Amino acid sequence: PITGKVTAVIGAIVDVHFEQSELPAILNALEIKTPQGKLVLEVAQHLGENTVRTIAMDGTEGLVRGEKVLDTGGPISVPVGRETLGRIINVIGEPIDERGPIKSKLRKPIHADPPSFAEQSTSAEILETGIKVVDLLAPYARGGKIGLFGGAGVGKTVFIQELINNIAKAHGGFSVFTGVGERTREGNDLYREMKETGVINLEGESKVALVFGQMNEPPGARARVALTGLTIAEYFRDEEGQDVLLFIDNIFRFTQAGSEVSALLGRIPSAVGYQPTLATDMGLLQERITTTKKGSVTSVQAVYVPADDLTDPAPATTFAHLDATTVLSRGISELGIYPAVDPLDSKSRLLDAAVVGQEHYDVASKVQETLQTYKSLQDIIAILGMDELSEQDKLTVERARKIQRFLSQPFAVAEVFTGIPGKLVRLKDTVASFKAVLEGKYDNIPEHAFYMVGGIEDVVAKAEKLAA
């Protein structure tokens, strides 16, 4: 029985003295029996003399030195299973959905090593999406990192909700929304809302699994929520063959949590107050986000940058990982578009000609040129007058404002919220719609016939209905 006695409690950095030759290995998980149930300490050093230095996950307030510790023997093993979908789970893999003990199959270590070069994606793949704006100008990609920008609420969370619905149709996938630095009140609303919109139904089926990591939870537990979440996803991917889409919240709070743990460990935080092991921490996490031969994880991450500084090293490191960036605009939401997506500031690097198909690319390039010209033209056209438009320019304006309306396409989750049943639009059919709009088949069809509709088929119906 590998046991050791607490020999320090300076902060949440608890040094434990183990009897000789009965030493845990680094990254092992220790459990200290406590009236707090357990305190999980993760061994992060060997200080020698048969003592270690560990970090704590659960708070150490009122800890008494010399208390016996028991060594689990390896990085925390968190429950996994289809059963575990629809559970709000704390870092230590215990229900915080409060609907009692998680029904589990197998439990698995929170730390895991990135798959081999061979088991990394050898050729790109384009994950299907149902938002047309997404499907043209930043098509999702399997194993991809898609970094959200723009406000929450009617912004990010509703968008995230839509994706879960779409994913369920798209594959039949699952998700795990991991929320780091989560305001627990807002999280409650999200959980209740997620229940209401039925992406979680525990009287039914719950696709998304929730891991909420509140800000009041210690920094160590803030750091470890992500690694746990990825493991859950990986059980689906590798061992249930699934394709999943894993939401992560703020990576500012990912950085923030890690930075503290480094500083506590005594490691000199590099410039702009960010840990020396900054690169590696993203590196391990975001190289476990990949398309394996068994399945593919795909991760939608939320990238909240502090002070709008993209020059900050942590955002830069994020952008290195990011394959796409989705930049929600509030101006766009104000143009009556839900999608709230800013099409000209939404960009993906997987958008290249061959990558998305030549037709798709050419259509996209035209739509980009159309929108780019529409905006620029509208700048001085508004000032000069709309009648100062050329025949070509007002053809473009006519088409463009029709495209602007065409962007409006309710979201399935937002069936209640907008009041209009969502319009799911498949990627091929999105291209088809734009080919026709480019060819002006719908430039004789009214603007608000494109308002709040989906694909080509949908706007055939609405074209008729707007008139009739």
Partner 1 sequence: EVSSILEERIKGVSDEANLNETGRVLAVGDGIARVFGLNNIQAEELVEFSSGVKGMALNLEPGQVGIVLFGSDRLVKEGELVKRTGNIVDVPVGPGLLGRVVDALGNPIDGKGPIDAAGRSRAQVKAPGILPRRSVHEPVQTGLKAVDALVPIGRGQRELIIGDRQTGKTAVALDTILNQKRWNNGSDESKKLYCVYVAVGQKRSTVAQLVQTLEQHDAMKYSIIVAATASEAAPLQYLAPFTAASIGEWFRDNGKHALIVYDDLSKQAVAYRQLSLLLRRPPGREAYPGDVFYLHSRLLERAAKLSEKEGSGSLTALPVIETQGGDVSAYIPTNVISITDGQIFLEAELFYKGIRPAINVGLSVSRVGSAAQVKALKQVAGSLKLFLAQYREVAAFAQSDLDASTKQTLVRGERLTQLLKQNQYSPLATEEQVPLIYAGVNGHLDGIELSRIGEFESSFLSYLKSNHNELLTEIREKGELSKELLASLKSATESFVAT
Partner 2 sequence: QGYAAEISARRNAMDNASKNAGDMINRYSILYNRTRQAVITNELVDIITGASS
Q: Which residues bind partner 1 (CB under 8 A)?
A: 7-11, 15, 59-66, 88, 96-98, 153, 181, 183-189, 191-192, 212, 214-216, 218-219, 252, 256, 259-260, 263-264, 269, 273, 304, 306-307
Sign for the CA dihedral angle at 329, 334, 340, 342 comes to negative
Rounded to whole angstroms, the Cα distance separating 406 from 432 reads 13
User: Which range, of 66-74, 243-251, 306-314, 434-442, touches partner 2 by CB under 8 A?
Assistant: 306-314
Partner interacting with residue 311 (select from partner 2, partner 1, none; CB below 5-8 Å by kind): partner 2
Of residues 307 and 467, the one with the C-beta less far from partner 2:
307
388 lies in the binding site for partner 2 (CB under 8 A): no
Catalytic residue among 156, 222, 253, 423: 156
Determine if residue 152 is labeled as part of a ligand binding site.
yes
Active-site residue flag, 182: yes
Angle between helices 184-196 and 156-170 (to 10 degrees): 40
Catalytic residue among 128, 162, 182, 217: 182
Long-range pairs for 271-277: beta carbons < 8 A, 24 or more residues apart: 271/313, 272/312, 272/313, 272/314, 274/312, 274/313, 274/314
DSSP state of 98: -
For 99, the token pair is: 């609907």
- The closest alpha carbon to 312, from 262, 265, 255, belongs to 255
Of residues 234 and 312, the one with the C-beta less far from partner 2:
312
Cα distance between the two ends of the chain: 80
User: Which range, of 72-80, 119-127, 271-279, 357-365, touches partner 2 by CB under 8 A?
Assistant: 271-279
Determine if residue 156 is labeled as part of a ligand binding site.
yes
Are the CB atoms for 275 and 266 separated by under 8 Å? Answer: no
Whether cis (ω within 30° of 0) applies to the bond prior to 343 is no
Partner interacting with residue 63 (select from partner 2, partner 1, none; CB below 5-8 Å by kind): partner 1
Active-site residue flag, 156: yes
Of residues 63 and 263, the one with the C-beta less far from partner 2:
263
Are the CB atoms for 450 and 405 separated by under 8 Å? Answer: yes
Of residues 192 and 267, the one with the C-beta less far from partner 2:
267
DSSP state of 113: P
309 lies in the binding site for partner 2 (CB under 8 A): yes
Q: How far is the CB of 184 from partner 1 (least distance, A)?
A: 6
Query: Residues interacting with partner 2, by CB under 8 A?
Result: 268, 271-273, 307, 309, 311-312
What are the binding residues?
150-157
